[PDB]
């Protein structure tokens, strides 16, 4: 109800973060991946994510199995 309105706003900035994600993600966050996506993480949760290999597996399962 009242949350639906904000949902239009709180989401108006959630759709952008994705619009400018696949863009930079293409360069493997080079600008600071070696000093952030490898140094500011220290495999803290990089190996736990691996989304890089599930980005399509998580969606490919949606076609059947909602996995």
From Swiss-Prot:
Residues 44-67 are annotated as: Lipoprotein lipase cofactor. Residues 32-40 are annotated as: Lipid binding. This is Apolipoprotein C-II. The chain holds residues 35 to 101 of 101 of the full protein.
């Amino acid at each position: 109800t009242f949350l639906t309105q904000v949902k239009e706003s709180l989401s108006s900035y959630w759709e952008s973060a994705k619009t400018a994600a696949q863009n930079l993600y293409e360069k493997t966050y080079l600008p600071a991946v070696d000093e952030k996506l490898r140094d500011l993480y220290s495999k803290s949760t990089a190996a736990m994510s691996t989304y890089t290999g599930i980005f399509t597996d998580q969606v490919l399962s949606v076609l059947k199995g909602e996995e």
